[PDB]
Amino acid sequence: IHWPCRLTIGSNLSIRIAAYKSILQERVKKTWTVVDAKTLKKEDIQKETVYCLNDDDETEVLKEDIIQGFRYGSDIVPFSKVDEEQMKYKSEGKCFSVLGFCKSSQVQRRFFMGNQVLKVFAARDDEAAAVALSSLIHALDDLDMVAIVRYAYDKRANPQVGV
Amino acid sequence: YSGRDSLIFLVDASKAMFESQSEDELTPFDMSIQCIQSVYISKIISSDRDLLAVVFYGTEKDKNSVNFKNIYVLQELDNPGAKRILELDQFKGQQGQKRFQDMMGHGSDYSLSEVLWVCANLFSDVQFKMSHKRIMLFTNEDNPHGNDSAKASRARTKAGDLRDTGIFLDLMHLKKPGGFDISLFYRDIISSKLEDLLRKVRAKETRKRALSRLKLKLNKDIVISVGIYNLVQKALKPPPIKLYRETNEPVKTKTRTFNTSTGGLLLPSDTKRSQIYGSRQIILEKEETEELKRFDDPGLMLMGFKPLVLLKKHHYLRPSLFVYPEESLVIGSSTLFSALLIKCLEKEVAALCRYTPRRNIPPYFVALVPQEEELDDQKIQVTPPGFQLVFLPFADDKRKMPFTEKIMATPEQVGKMKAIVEKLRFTYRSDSFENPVLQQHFRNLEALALDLMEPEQAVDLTLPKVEAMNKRLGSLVDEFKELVYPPDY
Amino acid sequence: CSLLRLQETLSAADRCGAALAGHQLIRGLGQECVLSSSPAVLALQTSLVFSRDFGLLVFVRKSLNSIEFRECREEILKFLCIFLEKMGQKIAPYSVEIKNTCTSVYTKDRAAKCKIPALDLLIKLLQTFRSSRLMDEFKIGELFSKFYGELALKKKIPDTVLEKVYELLGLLGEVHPSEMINNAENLFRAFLGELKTQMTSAVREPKLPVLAGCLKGLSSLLCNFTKSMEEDPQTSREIFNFVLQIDLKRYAVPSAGLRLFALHASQFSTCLLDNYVSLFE
Amino acid sequence: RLFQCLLHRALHPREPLPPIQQHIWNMLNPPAEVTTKSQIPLSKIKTLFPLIE
DNA sequence: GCTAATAAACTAAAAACTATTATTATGG
DNA sequence: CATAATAATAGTTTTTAGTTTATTGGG
């Protein structure tokens, strides 16, 4: 689906762009639904996560009285969901902003990272800007230039630096 | 190679933490304390497999298990942790310095040979795989050989023993930085970075031991022992260890399959895998599932040779892994691969295989980028001699685009924007990317481990700007964007 | 006395967390172990109450994951089991005591961080029943009720050499009420399933250790009287001999299966008609 | 392989499952004519270097 | 006028790091 | 049957592998 964004760098550049996945596995849709061998009814199957405590009787307690610890150094630091929910901050929105330029000769295929190929599309609703972006594509190709881009996957995800 | 890097922190107590000593700052006590605190934080975030102990050569009233005179033992050898952070915060800042004055005081008499004795004891205390053992020391007293010559001779003897023992010691500028002036004669047994130590770069985890090694069963006859490794990693969320929100007690979340109907604990045996498709629930089993994934033995079966010219940007997958030649049960692996690398100018036609990761799991086509012995002049083996495992996609690895084929623009645009981009050439730096969420997370952890007022939000190099490139280049990019109604809507 | 001195200083040298202190404690444990190894009848009676008191002391007071406790009480259970060899029935009002203590011990890390203490637990209690049946072996009813509650447990996360499914955890110390019968038929179908899994003896999935090391010995103590020669499962378990491939390494496990086949040779009727010579050779 | 297993368990779920396949497994194998042209130089290298220790 | 098509996170996960004990060989 | 036999069958924390988590969506 459309990944709308404006590729904005500096005080001048802002190009409306819709990103799309090019390389992407089609995973199996219907899963290996485990069913009772003697009735084949997953509906008659329960998956309960009995949050027991470290007790002899291991008294179960919901997360109501449970916090999320973290083994910080030779100790554990517990952060509640709101505690670990306010400490956070990421690039809000479908962010995509190039950091600068460099020759692609500096990097190598052995120096790549990321799992797919993401063909970002041209300018949105601006064919003049689209062909200008095509010419900029050519300009990058001639100089081996790279669009090193800070990319927040969306509002919901963290930023991810890419090119 | 596993091993605990034991590090000892020798800090003076008489004046080397308290005399300016050819400088003008305050007592080096506070700066040294903050330096070591920073490095402790750096280890906590980056390395918790390295033991640490702090010692105070010079002691008016001994705090030492050794009970030797002029020995102040604060923290024993142990991995970094919050108790030690509080321990040092007691002696942090000028308030911590006046504390130091309180319980033991400065101007403390020293016992150098006994200090070597007790730190040797501490080194002997460890019972684990050790990677490195360093004595870290700061002193305004660069050359206190003015002591009795017996003490100096015994100390040099102990130094010969410990470096002979392999114990390492570091003294670094505190009095006369640079010009080799520091350590006017304590250069005899020892043969700047304060900025880095205070900088406490952290959150760096790296391979410690070998893992994931296989063989190159290229044909049905030949195998070649190798090893598969990673240097590109996806940063994790640190483990949310469910603790009792009151009592900080862990959780035994007893999750199992069960029955919603008859109240019985089901098992994978009396249950079956299944696939609700069309008019037939396609049944399966756990070992049935494994077999459906069980294709062949792990290893590298050679499927061909392809030039390093078909590989293109769209020919890309998950980040590549590495193969190093190995000789455990295949003689000549390294030798034959050395032949391959010397004739790699012709071996741009790299190996082709459908790599099987392990047993019970299918193979997958993954190309292999020939890694040379790219050893730098400073002797850094960047891209060690081997093969990078760029993964060959399938028709699975596709999400198609539309085909609104766009045509090129006038060449003046290309030229002016080439001038723009090369004028706006960002300084290349591979080690320049730190994730703001990651960094800020580290800062929250470290800050909300003490009673810190706030965790700093690390302004990362990954953050784009508005005017830095608009002063390195300017608005001539937009003026060059001469088309009516630019994409700046 | 030496017993008293260890009961006190050992109960004193357990101060806060010093694993060095706790392993000098395991050292004094070894001393008491060799003391019991050199026993006297009066020393027998004295060590009985010392066992009660200070074993309960280490049982309750330590009760923590500290490595000192880990190893010290590991060898504590080791010593208790290796002493179980001989007390006589004198451990009868003291049997139920340590029965409950050991059940709770299982409910401890020996459910979470099961180790050598867990097998110590198991062997001690099992040899206890086979040394003493049904004078306090009635609490064991509800004990196994809970056990089967945690035996129907799907969680096979625990350690392989501490797995509990196919050779020794025999359970028939009680009168075999319908409780264990109803639980046991489910146990039996589980045995069938995971043994069928086991005999894929071409798929390089041995899983032999204590995985094939506890609960079909539970079957051994269970199959003695259950599921007579009346159905397909009979011939299935008959077939379950076939491999019992080559093993070497003393081939204990194939020989173990063969020994069980010896145990229930009586249970081998109505189908062994087949394959005279193959079986016999 | 998943598809043909689906066909098995659909038409005849009451059967043991087949192997992965031949034909689908068949179409992954490396070039046979390359093996033919290789076996002589392949023999040269393989006999040239023992691969055991 | 409607109603995914995802993708932050799932919540996990199989890796020898390490090897004591049994090995059943040979004093007993 | 002799009785300290000294190898494999794991013990390990591995990172790293498939986990629904999520919202735009046909009216």
Curated annotation (Swiss-Prot), chain A:
PTM summary: ADP-ribosylated by PARP3. Phosphorylated on serine residues. Phosphorylation by PRKDC may enhance helicase activity.
Modified residues (N6-acetyllysine): K21, K88
Origin: domain of life: Eukaryota
Keyword annotations from UniProtKB, A to Z: Acetylation, Activator, ADP-ribosylation, ATP-binding, Chromosome, DNA damage, DNA recombination, DNA repair, DNA-binding, Helicase, Host-virus interaction, Hydrolase, Immunity, Innate immunity, Isopeptide bond, Nucleotide-binding, Nucleus, Phosphoprotein, Ribosome biogenesis, Systemic lupus erythematosus, Transcription, Transcription regulation, Ubl conjugation
Signal sequence coordinates: none
Domain Ku: 9-163
Cellular localisation: Nucleus; Nucleus, Nucleolus; Chromosome
Modified residues (Phosphoserine): S11, S14, S74
Job description of the protein: Single-stranded DNA-dependent ATP-dependent helicase that plays a key role in DNA non-homologous end joining (NHEJ) by recruiting DNA-PK to DNA. Required for double-strand break repair and V(D)J recombination. Also has a role in chromosome translocation. The DNA helicase II complex binds preferentially to fork-like ends of double-stranded DNA in a cell cycle-dependent manner. It works in the 3'-5' direction. During NHEJ, the XRCC5-XRRC6 dimer performs the recognition step: it recognizes and binds to the broken ends of the DNA and protects them from further resection.
Entry protein name: X-ray repair cross-complementing protein 5
Source organism per UniProt: Homo sapiens
Gene symbol of the encoding locus: XRCC5
Span of the entire protein shown here: 245 to 407 of 732
UniProtKB/Swiss-Prot annotation, chain B:
Every Ku domain range: 216-423
Gene Ontology biological process terms, A to Z: activation of innate immune response; cellular hyperosmotic salinity response; cellular response to gamma radiation; cellular response to X-ray; double-strand break repair via classical nonhomologous end joining; double-strand break repair via nonhomologous end joining; innate immune response; negative regulation of DNA-templated transcription
Interaction with XRCC5, as annotated region: 328-437
Statement: the UniProt record of this protein carries the keyword Acetylation: yes
Residue ranges, annotated region (DNA-binding): 232-296
Cross-link Glycyl lysine isopeptide (Lys-Gly) (interchain with G-Cter in SUMO2) per UniProt, renumbered positions: K242, K272
Post-translational modification note: Phosphorylation by PRKDC may enhance helicase activity. Phosphorylation of Ser-20 does not affect DNA repair. ADP-ribosylated by PARP3.
Outcome reported for the amino acid change (mutating K129A): Abolishes adduct formation
Residues bearing the modification Phosphothreonine: T410
EC number in record: 3.6.4.-, 4.2.99.-
Entry GO terms, CC: chromosome, telomeric region; cytosol; DNA-dependent protein kinase complex; DNA-dependent protein kinase-DNA ligase 4 complex; extracellular region; ficolin-1-rich granule lumen; Ku70:Ku80 complex; membrane
Localization terms from the record: Nucleus; Chromosome; Cytoplasm
Induction: In osteoblasts, by FGF2.
Keywords assigned: Acetylation, Activator, ADP-ribosylation, ATP-binding, Chromosome, Cytoplasm, DNA damage, DNA recombination, DNA repair, DNA-binding, Helicase, Host-virus interaction, Hydrolase, Immunity, Innate immunity, Isopeptide bond, Lyase, Methylation, Multifunctional enzyme, Nucleotide-binding, Nucleus, Phosphoprotein, Systemic lupus erythematosus, Transcription, Transcription regulation, Ubl conjugation
Residues recorded as bearing N6-acetyllysine in the entry: K272, K286, K293, K416
From Swiss-Prot, chain C:
Compartments in which it is found: Nucleus; Nucleus, Nucleolus; Cytoplasm, Cytosol
Organism of origin: Homo sapiens (Human)
Family note: Belongs to the PI3/PI4-kinase family.
Disulfide-bonded cysteines: none
Disorder: Immunodeficiency 26 with or without neurologic abnormalities: A form of severe combined immunodeficiency characterized by reduced or absent T and B cells, recurrent candidiasis, and lower respiratory tract infections. Some patients show dysmorphic features, severe growth failure, microcephaly, seizures, and impaired neurological functions.
Subunit structure: DNA-PK is a heterotrimer of PRKDC and the Ku dimer (composed of XRCC6/Ku70 and XRCC5/Ku86). Formation of this complex may be promoted by interaction with ILF3. Component of the core long-range non-homologous end joining (NHEJ) complex (also named DNA-PK complex) composed of PRKDC, LIG4, XRCC4, XRCC6/Ku70, XRCC5/Ku86 and NHEJ1/XLF. Additional component of the NHEJ complex includes PAXX. Following autophosphorylation, PRKDC dissociates from DNA. Interacts with DNA-PKcs-interacting protein (KIP) with the region upstream the kinase domain.
Location of this fragment in the whole protein: 10 to 295 of 4128
Positions of modified residues (N6-acetyllysine): K108
Entry comment on modification after translation: Autophosphorylated at two clusters, the T2609 cluster and the S2056 cluster. Autophosphorylation induces a conformational change that leads to remodeling of the DNA-PK complex, requisite for efficient end processing and DNA repair.
Swiss-Prot record, chain D:
Subcellular location(s) of the protein: Nucleus; Nucleus, Nucleolus; Chromosome
Entry's induction text: In osteoblasts, by FGF2.
Post-translational modification summary for this protein: ADP-ribosylated by PARP3.
Linked residues for Glycyl lysine isopeptide (Lys-Gly) (interchain with G-Cter in SUMO2): K44, K46
Comment field on protein domains: The EEXXXDDL motif is required for the interaction with catalytic subunit PRKDC and its recruitment to sites of DNA damage.
Similarity comment: Belongs to the ku80 family.
Protein's job: Single-stranded DNA-dependent ATP-dependent helicase that plays a key role in DNA non-homologous end joining (NHEJ) by recruiting DNA-PK to DNA. Required for double-strand break repair and V(D)J recombination. Also has a role in chromosome translocation. The DNA helicase II complex binds preferentially to fork-like ends of double-stranded DNA in a cell cycle-dependent manner. It works in the 3'-5' direction. During NHEJ, the XRCC5-XRRC6 dimer performs the recognition step: it recognizes and binds to the broken ends of the DNA and protects them from further resection.
Name of this protein: X-ray repair cross-complementing protein 5
Organism encoding this protein: Homo sapiens (Human)
Gene: XRCC5
